Amino acid sequence: AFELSAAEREAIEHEMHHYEDPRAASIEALKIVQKQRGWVPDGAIHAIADVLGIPASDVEGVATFYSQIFRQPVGRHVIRYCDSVVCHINGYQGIQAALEKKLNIKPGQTTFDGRFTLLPTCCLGNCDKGPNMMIDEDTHAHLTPEAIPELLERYK
């Protein structure tokens, strides 16, 4: 049971205006649906395939190819902590252990209430201020494991 709203459809069409192919707005269409609904459900793939005219298999391949186009339900906030080499030298494992101790889950799982979804991510492009962590729209640098509980209370 899915139906695109007015704002999502108008934004999708405006993204089709930017290119010479309606296929090229598929990634931004999926990002619009992810922004509105938290993730991309099953009917959204067919709705985007209907508005763009491309096959639904293409939309499914694009949606499942990219990591930050979520195809499964997430919590209220998605924590994306960096696990790459520079933050490993800076010790991201302490922050991962702190988040595992606080949220009492594993990387990739969601809490029973649906508050935080903990996920590793690639390099955040801020390696000089490592280690970093990207919550939904905010990046955090110079992290310490003791500041994790104080950091997680700013997202109810």
């Binding site: 192919d21 598929s26 990002k31 696990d83 080499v85 030298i89 000089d128």
Partner: protein, 439 residues
């Protein structure tokens, strides 16, 4: 650290409070004058010739000549639909130059894209920008709107007669999207699988049209060339690779950061004069010059100039010249394990050797990290490095993946040999069948 316009042709206009520079402030400090000279006093062909004579190498990591790349577009006038792409992805670990280049100086990128679009007569330009750079995206949209309002983007720019439209395409977070053909594929809304070369993107690129993909730092380098001349750009350093590169050391150093230095400065100077060396109670073990896809080097390689050919002579690459320092406390087996986990979980999945051999190296390094290594794993890793070199795979992600593995095998073989504790056992004893015992 003070930055005159001469030896810092890009980083002299930032702000001490680390705030972006807008159109009035950018234009106040000699901004959009290289674009003015390019659109008013020069043809596109002589602009391409000026960039070619400047010796501006592409700062994306390969160092290919940008003017020669611009000269490879088709000279036929029947193809007037042309595209310029700015690779603002920067998904390599250890790379942070583009973030500083667009979060604080977006109008420099806009001016360089104007100049490069006029040089190619490219009708449209796209900034393929990564999804994590949010403030950079906001600054880019604000800069595009401000330049469009004040007669710098759109229709009849300055009155020359050149129409150019600039867009920001925010990516969905895949490491392989940074590759130029995969960037073109992801720009067209498809999966980010790279394409075969030849045909190169300069002839049949985005939507089958002539399309030139350039790094952010190359487009930030071009307006200084167009404003202050070509021979001035050739008179910055006495090195074969002309220009200024944004270098810097990162990772357990005293002052990690980003500094614009001329080519030929030795890597010890960046570690000591700028990064300050190692931290309190730390020693130096290794370093890696060009992000995660580069070979490790030792202390004896620290007094080596930071050029393409000099680092390429000593069994490594210049890359993005954003070096990473690895101390003595960090175990190299676990470090290479993390590098291989990143390189195997971010593979595009098209071609066989990377897709089905990088996880094998990941599992072997997992066994070595836990001490469960078996005899024959290091030889397997060496043959894996041999068979994942250039030409074996469809693209260059896997040679860059196996460069640190072979460098750590070469220099730190005693750390890899320490992870083997259990004997080799692949089969198990089936009751009723005598096994074959090769000798």
């Amino acid at each position: 650290i003070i930055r005159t316009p001469e030896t810092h042709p890009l980083t002299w206009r930032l702000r001490d409070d680390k705030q972006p520079v807008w159109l009035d402030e950018y234009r106040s400090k000699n901004g959009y004058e290289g674009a003015r000279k390019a659109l008013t006093g020069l043809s596109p062909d002589e602009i391409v010739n000026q960039v070619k004579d400047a010796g501006l190498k592409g700062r994306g990591g390969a160092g290919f000549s940008t003017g020669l790349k611009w000269s490879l577009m088709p000279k036929d006038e029947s193809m007037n639909i042309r595209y310029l792409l700015c690779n603002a992805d920067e998904m390599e670990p250890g790379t942070y130059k583009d973030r500083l280049l667009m979060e604080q100086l977006p109008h420099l990128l806009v001016e360089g894209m104007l100049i490069s679009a006029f040089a190619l007569k490219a009708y449209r330009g796209y900034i393929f920008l990564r999804g994590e750079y949010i403030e950079a995206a906001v600054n880019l949209r604000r800069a595009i709107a401000e330049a469009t309002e004040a007669g710098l983007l759109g229709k009849n720019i300055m009155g020359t007669g050149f129409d150019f439209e600039l867009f920001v395409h925010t990516g969905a977070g895949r490491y392989i999207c940074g590759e130029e053909t995969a960037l073109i594929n992801s720009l067209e809304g498809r999966r980010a699988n790279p394409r075969s070369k030849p045909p190169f993107p300069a002839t049949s690129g985005a939507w089958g049209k002539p399309t030139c993909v350039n790094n952010v730092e190359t487009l930030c380098n071009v307006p200084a060339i167009l404003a202050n001349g070509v021979e001035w750009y050739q008179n910055i350093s006495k090195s074969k690779d002309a220009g200024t590169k944004l270098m810097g050391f990162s990772g357990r150093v005293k002052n990690p950061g980003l500094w614009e230095l001329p080519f030929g400065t030795t890597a010890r100077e960046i570690l000591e004069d700028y990064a300050g060396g190692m931290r309190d109670g730390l020693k130096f073990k290794a370093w890696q010059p060009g992000g995660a896809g580069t070979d490790f080097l030792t202390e004896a390689h620290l007094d080596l100039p930071m050029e393409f050919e000099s680092i390429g002579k000593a069994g490594s690459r210049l890359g993005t010249a954003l070096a990473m320092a690895v101390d003595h406390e960090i175990n190299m087996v676990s470090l290479v394990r993390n590098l291989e986990e990143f390189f195997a979980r971010e593979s595009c999945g098209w071609c066989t050797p990377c897709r089905d051999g990088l996880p094998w190296s990941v599992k072997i390094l997992r066994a070595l990290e836990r001490g469960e290594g078996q005899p024959g794993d290091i030889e397997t890793l060496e043959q894996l490095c041999r068979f994942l070199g250039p030409g074996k795979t469809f693209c260059a992600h896997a040679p860059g993946a196996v460069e640190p593995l072979q460098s750590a095998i070469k220099y730190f073989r005693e750390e890899f040999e320490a992870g083997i504790k259990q004997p080799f056992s692949n089969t198990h004893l089936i009751n009723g069948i005598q096994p074959n015992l090769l000798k």
